[PDB]
Design a protein around this ligand. Structure first.
Ligand code: NAP
Ligand code: UHC
Ligand code: PN7
Lengths: 238, 79, 237, 238, 234, 81
């Protein structure tokens, strides 16, 4: 388990996969978890029901994390409901990999607009709602690795590298108010043998293993860590 | 059923350099997945080698989407 | 100076500053330089005249490097004029600094779209026009800001950190056909608070950035691709 | 309160400072800690008594971590006492700062042999004793100075940059047997105003903040992380 | 040719391979090259004659680059002969790979002592002899990649990572005299499927990268590590 | 004699300082300061101390050397302890 001075967390794109397990993990550690979804509510509702049945604190909130006004209003609604917001996990990325010569700038815009602007809005609003309290932690999570090998990832890498650098800039901006910003870069996550081939630990990662890395960066245990990128990839990249 | 689809989906995804989620039954090799001329030949030869079949050129030209080739492969490979 | 197997280079946003000095340096080493500009042509024309009067080969070409059709058509026109395009430098970029809490997503998008999507178009088209001849070199002009971040530069750092990582994926896609992609990360360039933290104890000259670009285009870096070359006087290691 | 499948840990150079707080932290999370010291036992005895008085499990063990035979025998003694060794922290190190023009080759060797070869011995013996368990985690305590270098620290930076890279090679060799190797790179830790000016979090780090990052990397919570270098520097280096 | 304000260069481990190609490249670019050899004089003499027969300036000099007195005195002799020393290339590394559990500590110690101490002495003496000129450049070259896979390299990686971090620290100290320090990390120089350029690198491709870092064209570059590996690592 | 020695000692010290700092030996008087009068920077002084240390075969501890500011300080130091 891990220690948290803060009380609640918003997780964008939290209905399924890594996002849902982040919600599950953080709720089991005692945080009230806010499960963001954009379109179909049924999976998010089922997650919220599951977590409450397990004795945890959970709520759902519908909004498009790539929409400035929708995200801003959602955080205002959480602050109204809970009194504040301690923690934020930006996980609303999309993946659409193509060879660059086959990719329209529309396709590139699609991925970058969504992945970078969503993380930008969340980080910006975290500075606003976290600063008075002199306390906060924000984790920016990159997309799971798409294919085997190194092709088709020009908009994936643009998104991921942009996120990591912009997170460092937020780390400077939040530092005096003790608002930390860190990134997590997952490897191949089970969410076969040919993939496991190049992974030193000789297995795909579990979603829970990524979620516990996120939990560490949110937790009090990482209080002197900001502007860092934590790789969770079984040794695939060092 | 699904096992053959997964198996074929993986070949298509690596051949055409797309993430698997794009390779749905309704996805068209050219229109949606961006296969060019060399890609089509390369993909045909890879599936022919994988499954031990040989597709008539005229019938290859009528495989427009992923479901079409999965159906062709169930019908024609050896049990 | 430096050895080049290729004959010509397109430099986006080349009318002044670092971009103009890249044009000046590369022209002086024998390359025909294509000077991109978007808006007013007088500064670009004066650079072109300067280089031709110095005995070099230079031409101007107007296009918005953030516009897909405009950039694509410009490279097509160069290929028609020159027979091909050996080299590309993605230098076009803007800054709109401000603390994030005072930054509209508008201010974010503008810098992202202008700085990162332009490099995407340029690198993509370089793959297209350089592949048949199995030869090319592309340099993306990034920044120390994309490596370490900076207060008030969430948008610029996103665009330049995105550029650095994207350039490596282009390096993977061009490598089989000998099309190399590398980035340069200038520090504080003249084009004493600043200088305090710089070990060489001075700002860099634009020429010093231009010669690092020239190295990565040149034959001398023929086994170097997917690299990010720091040009910052020791400010960041 | 973090979860540990393993039961014990050896921390080299653990009498004081960061090493002592690593022992303090890990004992408080239920591990049996072996407190290494090379010469003066009083401070290590006092640390052991402090932990045992708190209801924790602790032991002291005298050896020079730069001596192959001394280190090898000490791990053998721990395996005889405890039945095995789950976890290792290579913390032992010295400084001998000097402008290079004033640095004797012996001054350089002194730091390399004490700081880098010590970590080689410990990492190697960890591979040997944790392999039949197919379980283990090893943390190498490096430094920001091994990442960015520093005036007057050519020898220290060489020893710690070598440690950071060597650790990744151990990660590759231990991965199939689930023996993870990670480094931590602390910044300026309190165990001067000019140096604080450059730290975004605007303070020196607490030894506890290093210890809890080390704990994370040993814990089950980091089970898909190997070959990593965790910065703990308040944003001083990103 | 590449532009050099300085006049001469010392290359440790210069008799063969990459070191010999660095000698050829720099000599062709107008520098007087000092070719270090420790054991075999014949190969170094042949290189010197090859370069002199091409109209270049070249000399041989015998020393063990991991010996403090020997390397210090060798630089002193070059300063006595030429009036100074503008450039230095540290390339005296050895590779002795073994699985860690099969590595004796004396094996680890020997590789790390050779590889790190030689670069340390070279860089330290560069600071001394280059300071009055308020000018200079030093390149530290890592050992080439010698394994298809990721095993057996604990002392290889200790040496390489140690050299890279050392060099950064020397960059801070030398910057007070405009003396630059940079590293070069070659890849597979003559698994090829793991190389994006799909070929081994030529020694000459490493040498010309080294030449750039010595040259005036890299005058604002210090504390950097330049990968020369065909995209093997990015 | 004691003055004969002084003369010779000062002459050796003067020549070391005059090369190290590239100044004329007539500028190198007992009262001249390395930085203020003889154009030295901080590193020059460190290099000067080392240059003196191995001509005269002595170790000047850092704490001592911090207080050596002018030519006379060097004369007194060698000539003393
Ligand atoms: O063996 P090795 O391994 O073949 O060493 C590789 C290269 O580095 C040189 N080298 C290695 N250690 C050296 C040292 N201490 N001093 C000078 N050159 C050195 C070798 O020259 P040598 O063959 O002269 O060692 C050889 O050219
Ligand atoms: P090349 O440049 O010679 O061809 C391009 C061209 C001229 C055929 C052009 O796209 C086209 O004319 N029309 C596209 C309409 C069309 O034919 N659609 C079906 C595409 S062919 C196809 O889908 C077969 C195929 O690739 C099956 C994949 C192999 C698995 C069996
Ligand atoms: C070379 C000098 C004397 C230059 O000083 P000036 O006033 O320019 C330099 O700062 C110095 O002593 N450095 C040693 C400082 C150091 O960091 N030592 C090791 C401790 S981290």
């Amino acid at each position: 388990s891990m220690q948290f001075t803060g009380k609640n967390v918003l997780i964008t794109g939290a209905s399924k996969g890594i996002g849902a397990e982040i919600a599950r993990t953080l709720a089991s550690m005692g945080l009230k978890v806010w499960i963001n979804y954009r379109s179909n509510a049924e999976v998010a509702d089922a997650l919220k029901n599951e977590l409450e049945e397990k004795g945890y604190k959970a709520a759902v909130i519908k909004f498009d994390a790539a929409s400035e006004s929708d995200f801003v209003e959602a955080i205002q609604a959480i602050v109204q409901s809970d009194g504040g917001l301690s923690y934020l996990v930006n996980n609303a990325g999309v993946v659409r990999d193509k060879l660059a010569i086959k990719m329209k700038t529309e396709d590139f815009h699609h991925v970058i607009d969504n992945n970078l602007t969503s993380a930008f809005i969340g980080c910006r609003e975290a500075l606003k709602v976290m600063s008075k309290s002199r306390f906060g932690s924000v984790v920016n999570i990159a997309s799971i690795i798409g294919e085997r090998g190194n092709m088709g990832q020009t908009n994936y890498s643009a998104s991921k590298g942009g996120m990591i650098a912009m997170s460092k800039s937020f780390a400077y901006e939040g530092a005096l108010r003790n608002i930390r910003f860190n990134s997590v870069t997952p490897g191949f996550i089970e969410t076969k043998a040919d993939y496991v081939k190049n992974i030193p630990l000789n297995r795909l990662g579990a979603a829970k293993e990524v979620a516990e890395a996120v939990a560490f960066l949110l937790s009090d245990h990482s209080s002197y860590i900001t502007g860092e990128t934590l790789k969770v990839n079984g040794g695939l990249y060092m | 059923l699904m096992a053959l689809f997964e198996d074929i989906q993986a070949v298509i995804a690596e051949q055409l350099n797309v993430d698997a989620a794009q390779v749905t039954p309704e996805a068209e090799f050219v229109k949606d997945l961006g296969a060019d001329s060399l890609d089509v030949v390369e993909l045909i030869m890879a599936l022919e080698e994988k499954f031990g079949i040989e597709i008539p050129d005229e019938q290859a030209e009528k495989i427009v989407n992923v479901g079409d080739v999965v159906k062709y492969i169930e019908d024609n490979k050896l049990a």
